């Protein structure tokens, strides 16, 4: 199918307590493969997937060099942004940056993206055309025009359509055992007596990959979405994911309820009944 590479950068100022904390992570699809943490002792970009560990010294020296440079950029950004917003020097602030690319089933360039946020809200983002910018506010406008004049977009476009997809394809090849698999969810239902006249039916999906999945409860067919407690998909910690969905049901009515599971790794949608 299609695939994606994404890099996530977070920088947090710590006034009067040294330089800001910088953390970087890389993902291919739903699999993390690298990280950098400015408070760690190594000071190198580090592997977080078995299929990336043997990439070689050049690869590791290079990402380390570039990620430190990202760290310095965010450090200047925090200083700049505080100025744009005329803010106190004592408070901690946060810059976030995401960029990456998608390829299609044919592994051809599909799209690219490059976005910042300041204190948890949109700041400036690259448009889908990869040539123009969207500025959230007045502060960002200054960035907008500065990047327009510096031809910043063109150079981002060169990376996104080249290096970014070039290496995405290389990683998909290296880790094709991990990255080009789908693990179908192992599903089951549990029953718990909430009272003498009520019970919890919980529908479980376990050990699946990728993260995308739909769990829906129905009574006679009518979506019980409004009465469904649904948890966020969560990491099991071994590279697989978990999700569940529960309804409170009148005792005696269990047979009216079905759980429907859609996932990429399933040949067909699953319909679980209690019986």
């Amino acid at each position: 199918g299609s695939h994606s590479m994404r890099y996530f950068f977070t920088s947090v100022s710590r006034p009067g307590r040294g330089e800001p904390r910088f953390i970087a992570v890389g993902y291919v699809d739903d699999t993390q493969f690298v990280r950098f943490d400015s408070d760690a002792a190594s000071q190198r970009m580090e592997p977080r997937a078995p299929w990336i560990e043997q990439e070689g010294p050049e690869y590791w020296d290079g990402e380390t060099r570039k990620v430190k440079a990202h760290s310095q950029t965010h450090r200047v950004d925090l200083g700049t942004l505080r100025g744009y917003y005329n803010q106190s020097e004592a408070g901690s602030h946060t810059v976030q940056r995401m960029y990456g690319c998608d390829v299609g089933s044919d592994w051809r360039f599909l799209r690219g993206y490059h976005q910042y946020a300041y204190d948890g809200k949109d700041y400036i983002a690259l448009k889908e055309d990869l040539r123009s910018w969207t500025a959230a506010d007045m502060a960002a406008q200054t960035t907008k025009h500065k990047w327009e004049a510096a031809h910043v977009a063109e150079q981002l476009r060169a990376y996104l359509e080249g290096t970014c997809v070039e290496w995405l394809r290389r990683y998909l090849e290296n880790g094709k055992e991990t990255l080009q698999r789908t693990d179908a969810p192992k599903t089951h239902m549990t029953h718990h007596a909430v009272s003498d006249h009520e019970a919890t039916l919980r529908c479980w999906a376990l050990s699946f990959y990728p993260a995308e999945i739909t769990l829906t409860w129905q009574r006679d067919g009518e979506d019980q979405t409004q009465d469904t407690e649904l948890v966020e998909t969560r990491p099991a910690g071994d590279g697989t994911f978990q999700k569940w969905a529960a309804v409170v049901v009148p005792s005696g009515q269990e047979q009216r309820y079905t759980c429907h599971v859609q996932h990429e790794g399933l040949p067909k949608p699953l319909t679980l009944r209690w019986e």
């Binding site: 950029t73 950004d77 700049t80 960035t143 990047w147 910043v152 990376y159 970014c164 290496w167």
Partner: peptide, 9 residues
């Protein structure tokens, strides 16, 4: 791989 550039706000 990360971008080699140095874009700044």
């Amino acid at each position: 791989k990360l971008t080699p550039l140095c874009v700044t706000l």
